[PDB]
Please model this.
Amino acid sequence: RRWDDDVVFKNCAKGVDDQKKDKRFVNDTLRSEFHKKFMEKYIK
Amino acid sequence: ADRKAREAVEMRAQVERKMAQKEKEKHEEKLREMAQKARERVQYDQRLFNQSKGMDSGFAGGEDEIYNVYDQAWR
Amino acid sequence: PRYSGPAPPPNRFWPGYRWDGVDRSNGFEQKRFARLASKKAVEELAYKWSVEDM
Amino acid sequence: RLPPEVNRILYIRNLPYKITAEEMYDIFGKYGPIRQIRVGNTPETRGTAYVVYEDIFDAKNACDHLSGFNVCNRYLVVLYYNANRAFQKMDTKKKEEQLKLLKEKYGI
Amino acid sequence: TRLYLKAEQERQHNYLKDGPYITAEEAVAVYTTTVHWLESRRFSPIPFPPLSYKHDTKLLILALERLKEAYSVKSRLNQSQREELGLIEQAYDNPHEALSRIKRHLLTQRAFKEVGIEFMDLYSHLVPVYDVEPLEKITDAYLDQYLWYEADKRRLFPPWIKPADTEPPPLLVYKWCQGINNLQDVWETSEGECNVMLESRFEKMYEKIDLTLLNRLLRLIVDHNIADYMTAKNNVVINYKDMNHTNSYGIIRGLQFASFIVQYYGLVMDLLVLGLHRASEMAGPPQMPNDFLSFQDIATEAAHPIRLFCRYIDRIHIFFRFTADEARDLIQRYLTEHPDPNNENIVGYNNKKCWPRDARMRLMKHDVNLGRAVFWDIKNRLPRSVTTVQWENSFVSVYSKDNPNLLFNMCGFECRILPKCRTSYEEFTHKDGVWNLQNEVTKERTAQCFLRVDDESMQRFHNRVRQILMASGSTTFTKIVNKWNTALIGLMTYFREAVVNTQELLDLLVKCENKIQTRIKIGLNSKMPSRFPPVVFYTPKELGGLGMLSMGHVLIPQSDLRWSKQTDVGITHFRSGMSHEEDQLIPNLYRYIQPWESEFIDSQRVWAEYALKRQEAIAQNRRLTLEDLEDSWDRGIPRINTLFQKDRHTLAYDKGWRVRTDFKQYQVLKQNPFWWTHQRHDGKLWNLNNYRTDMIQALGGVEGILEHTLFKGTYFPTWEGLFWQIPNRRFTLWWSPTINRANVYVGFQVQLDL
Amino acid sequence: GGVWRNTEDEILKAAVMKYGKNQWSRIASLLHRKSAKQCKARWYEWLDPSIKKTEWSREEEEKLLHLAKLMPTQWRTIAPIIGRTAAQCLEHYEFLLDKAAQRDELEMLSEARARL
Amino acid sequence: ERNRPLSDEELDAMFPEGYKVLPPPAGYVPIRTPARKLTATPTPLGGMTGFHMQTEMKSVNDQPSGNLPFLKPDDIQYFDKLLVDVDESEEQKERKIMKLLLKIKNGTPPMRKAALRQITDK
Amino acid sequence: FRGVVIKYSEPPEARIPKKRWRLYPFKNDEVLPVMYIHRQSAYLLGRHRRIADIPIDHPSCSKQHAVFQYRLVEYTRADGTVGRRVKPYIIDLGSGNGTFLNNKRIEPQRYYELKEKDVLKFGFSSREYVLL
Amino acid sequence: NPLTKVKLINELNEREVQLGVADKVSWHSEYKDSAWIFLGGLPYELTEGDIICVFSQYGEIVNINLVRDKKTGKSKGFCFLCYEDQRSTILAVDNFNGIKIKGRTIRVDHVSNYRAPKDSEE
RNA sequence: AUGAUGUCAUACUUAUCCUGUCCCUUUU
Model:
C-alpha cells in the first residue's frame, strides 16, 4: 500500500448503489433502459 | 464548514505573519550589525511595426464561401 | 567626417547627418512610412474582403 | 509630458461620514507635501473632499496610483478638480500691500 | 431534441423533487480540500470590477470584438441578432457608458431571462448548443474575459489543466510525446519495470456539478457579487419551440462564463483525482512555477507512482508508472476486490485499431490484470457523486516487458511510441511522418513515434463531405466547391502528418474528392460524362474556375494541353511537353507543405535566433530591421507576425484563446474549422501560396487555361484584367468550350437552332 | 427598452386572452413596441392572471428566509416553490428583509485550550 | 509659474463653501514637513508590499434617481451633489433640482428636448 | 531642471537595479536614515533646497561633487558567459578638490570595480560620514 | 502673421498628404534644383555653430551663413544654409518645419531663387 | 360634476430637415 493517500473518497464499492444491475424493464417508454441508452449514446 | 475553515485560514495566516515578523526582524538585526566593519568605515525599426491590420480572428465563422486561402492576388 | 552612433531616421535617402544630430525631426518621415505601410496593408485587406465571394 | 487640464487640486469622493483626517493625511501624503485639504461639513457636501499639493506632478502620481483606490468598502472617486466656476465670492484685492513690499524690500 | 429536453425535464424535476444531492459529507471534504489546496498555492482572491481600471476598457474592446466576429460574419440576420448587433454597435460608440451598464448589471441583477436552445447535428454525436439574450450575453462576455484576464494574471489554474495558449493540438501532441520520451529511464524494463497510459473522460461534468458547491468554489475564487452573478446566470430557463423545462439541475453549457466555470471544476476534480501532496509536488512550489510537464528535480519524478497527468477540457491523460512490487500489490488488491474466476478480465478490454497485429496492447496475464487494476483504483478514488469513468469508454494501454508497443490517444489523432531499446514491431511508415523523439539529455534517438489518423474524426470528415454532397441542386457550383475546399484545408492541416501516413485515410479522401467532382459533373450535365475534362474542375478560382483543392492523384487529359494562336501566318499550335511520365494535378500539401514535426523544430530554432538577434542588436544599439525580421517572420512557435502586428499593443491582455474557441464551438451553430488555431492569437500557419502557383504551372498556365476556355472568343487583347440560377450559367459558358464536346459526352447529335 | 405602459399592458392582456398563450409571434404583431420574447416574458411576469402581486405575509417571509440559506443562488428555482413565481418579487422581498434587519497550530492551540 | 507657493487666504479662495482644514495629531504634520526631506530620505530606505491568501461591504454610487442618464467618470466632480440620495429637507433645492442640466448634457434626445423647455420656462 | 542646468546625464544603457543593496549611512556610527537607490532613477544631493529634493548637512561639499548611479555595463560574469549585470558606476564629475575612496583618489573615465560596503566620501575635501 | 508661415507650410504639407499626391508633385517641383533653404524666426541667442550642429542630422551643410545685423554679434534671427543634395533640403523642409528649438519655434522653407542678404521677414 | 396645477406615455401638424464644414480666427 502507501500509494493511495491523496484520495478524498475512501472506498466507494458501489457502481449503481442498488445492485450490480437493475435487470428489470418498465411500462413507460421514456423511463426505460433503451431510451436512456439512446439518449446517452447518440446524444452528447 | 466555511465558518470553521475561514477561522482556520485566518489562524494560519496569523501564524505565518508572526513567523514572518520573527524572521525579518532577525534578518535585519543580522544585516545591520555587521561583524566586519558595520559602521567603523531595444529601438526597433518603425517600418517593421504596424505593417498590417488585425484584431479579428482570421477565420470569420465557418462558412466555406469567403475564399480564405490565397490571401494575395494573382498577377 | 562621419556620423555619430545614433539612429538616423530614413527618408528614402541615406544622408550624412553630423554635428550631434540627436533626434532633430518634426515627425514627418516616420508618419509617412507608417501611412505607406498602412496603405499597403489596407490594399491587401480590401482585396481579401472583395475576394470573399470570388 | 502632461495634459493641460489637470490641476494641483483633486476632487475626491465616495468617502465615509466617519472618516478621519489622520487616514487622509497619511494615505494622500505619499505623493508629496499637502498644500491643504478641505472636507464638506455641510448636508449635501458631506462625503466629499478636496486635496491640494505643493506640486502638480504630486497629484499626477496620485491619480495614477490612487485611481479607484480603496478605503473601507469604498472605491474613492478621484478626479482632477476644475477651475474658475464659482470664485468671485472672494475678491482680487490686497495686492497693494504685498506689491508695495516687494517694491520696498528688494527695491525692484 | 424534444425527447432529450423531456429527459432533462424529468431529471431536473427529480433532482429537485428528491433533494438527492452529492453526499454532503463528501461535499464538505471536497470544499475543505479545495480551500487547503488554494491556500497552499497561495492564490490571491479575484478582485471585483475595478471601476476606473486600466484593464477595463481594453478588456471590453477585446470581448466585444470576439462577440461581433462570432455573431456577425457575413450578411445574415434575424431580429434578435439584429438587436444584438445594434447593442454591440452602441457599445462600440459609447464605451464608458457600456462599461457602466455591465458593472451595474453584474453587481445588481442576480436574475436572468429565458435562454434559447436547439441542438446541431454533427450526425455522429449530437452536441447541443445554447443561445442567450443579447445584452445579458454582452455583459456576461465582458465578465468572462475579465475572469480569464485576472486568472492568468494570478496563475490560479495550474499547469496541470493544459489546454491553454501554447498552441492548439500539434504542440500538445509533440509535447506529451517528447515528455513521455524524456522521463528518467522509463522506456526500459529489464528489471521488470512497467508503465501504463490511461485515457478517460470524466463523463458527467456537464450535468453533475451542483450549484451550491459551485457557488462556494466561486466564493473561494472571486468576490461575493461576481460569485452570485455567475451562479445566478447559471440558472436561467431553457425553451425550445414549445416545451419549457426549468433550469438549476446543473450547469448550463454554452454561456460565456463556462471557461472559468469548467476550468475551475477541472482544477478541483483533478486534485481529488490525483492527491494533494503528489499534485503539489508535480505541480510546483508556489515560488517557482513549473513547465509544460517538467517536474523540478529527479526526486519528485521518482517518489510518486503517477508520473505525469495533463488534460484538455474533456480528456484526461495520466501515464501512471508503477514499480514491480507495487504492481504485484495493486494486482493483489484488484483481484481481492473483484475476484475473476475464469480469467474473465480479458473478456472485454477495449483496444486500438492501429494495425492490430503487432501493436495492439498485447493482452497477457499480468498486463491485462494491471490495466483492470489501475482502472479499479482510479474509479474507486473518484468522487463518486460527480465524476466517474467507464471501463467501456476508456482506453488503457500498457507498456511493459510484454506489450512492446504503447498507444496513447491525445486530442489529436492517436499516437504510438515504441522505443528502440525494446526492439519494437514493424510500423512500416507509409509516409515519411514517423514521430521521431530525441532523448533530452543524451541528444539521442531514444524512441520512434508513429501517428495515425483517428477514426472518430475520420468519420466526422466523411460525414461533412456527405453533407455537402447531399446539399446539391439548391446551391451554385461555386459554394459546393468552396465547401469542399474548406473541409480539405481543415482536415489536412490539424491532423496533418497523420493524414499523410494513415493509408485508409489517404484512400477515403481520394474517393470523396472524386465523388464531389462527380456531383459537380452530374450537376453540369445530366447524363454522366464519359470523361469530364479535368481542367474546368480542378483549375484556379480567379481565372474563372472552380478551385478544388485536390488532395488526390489525377493525371491530366494528356491531349487537353494545346495552345493555339494565329499570329502572322496562321495556326501555330503550341502543345505542352508532358512526355516525362504524365502530368499529375497537384498533392494535398504532404510533400508540398512542411510537416508539423519540422515546423516545431524550426519554430524553436527561429524563436531562439530571433531572441539572440535581439540581444545582438541591443548590444550594437540599433533597431532591428525588416531584413532580419524577414529572415524569419515564418512561425517558429506562434508567429513572428504576432510580434509585428497591431495586437502587439492591443490584444496582449487576453489569455484563453483556444479555450474560448472550444466554448465558442459549443456556443454557436457553425461547426467550423476552428479548433486548430485562432488566427489573431496564433497567427497564419495554414499557408497556401506556392500551391496556386504550381497548379497554374501544371494546368499549363493561363495560356492553356484560356485555350480550354472560350477566352479567345471575345478577342480581347491578352491576359489582363479578366475577372470581376445565375452563376452556374456563367461557369457554364466560361467553360462551355470544354464542357460541350462529343468526347466529353459520347453519343452526340444536335444542331441546336439558327 | 420595455417600459411596460398600462395601455400596452391592456393590449397585451387582450392579445393573450384573444389569440392564445403558446403563440408569441401572433401577439407581437399587434403592439409595435416589443418583440415576441419580451411579450412572453411580460405575460409570464406581470400579465399572468395567477400572479399574486400583493398580500405579503409572515408565512411566505418565513418560507423565503428558510430557503435562501439552503440555496444562496438560483432564485428562479425558488420562484414557484415559494409561491411568488414572479422571479423579481423574491429578490425584492429578500432585499427588504436584508435592509429591515440591518438598521495544525490552530488545532494544537484548541487542544491546549481545553487542557488549560 | 503655477507651482508658486500659496497662502491660506488664497487657499480659502479656491475651494467652494463648506469644508474644514482641521488636521489630525501634532505628530503627522511634522511628518508632512519632513516628508519633503523624507521624499528623498525615506524613498532611499527599506520598503515593499505583499499580500496573503485569505478568504473575504462594497458600497458605490451611480446616479441615484428614477433614471438619471449616465455620468462620465470625470463629470462626477460637477454632479456629485446629485449622487447623494438625501432628499426633501430653499436655494439648495434649486441647485439640486437644477441638475436638469445633466439631463441636457447627457441622455436621450427626448430628455434633452423636454429638459430644455422645462429649464426655459423656469 | 526646475531652476538650474542639469549636467552629468546617464547613458542609454541605464536600467533599474534588482540586487540586494541598500544605502546604510553612518555619520556617528548609527544608521538613522535609509534611502533606496534601486527604486529611483535619478538622485541629486547638494547644498541647495530649490534644485535638490532633500537637503544634506555637509558644508564642505559642493553642489556637484559625486554622482552614484547604477547602470548595467558590458562585463563578464564568473562563469565566463556575457550578459547584463547591474553594477554601480564610479566616475568623477570634475570636482574642484576631487574625491577619495578608501583613502585613495580615483580618476574619471576609468571603469573601476565598484562593489558594496565601500568606504567612500561625499565631499570635495573630507567627510565625517560614510555610506554602506 | 509672424508665426502663421510655419502653420501655412504645415497646412500645405497636410493638404498634399491628404489629397493623394505622389512624389513628383509633393511640393518639390517648384523648389527644385536648389539646396538653399530659407530659415527664419530663430532665437536671438542661437549661434551659427549650434544651428550648423542641429541642422546636420539630415546631411552635411555646404555653405551656411547667418543674417548679420547690429554690429556687435551679427544677430537678426534669419539664416541661410545650403545642404549637399536637394533630398536633404526636402527632408529638412518636411521634418524640421515649424519645430520648436530653445523656446521660440523656428520656420523651415525653401526659396530656390538666389542668395540675398535681406530676403526674410523679422 | 366641469376646471386646477402635476410626473408620464400616445397621436397630430409644420410640403421641417440629412453631405454641413472652417472660402476666411491666423491673436504673441
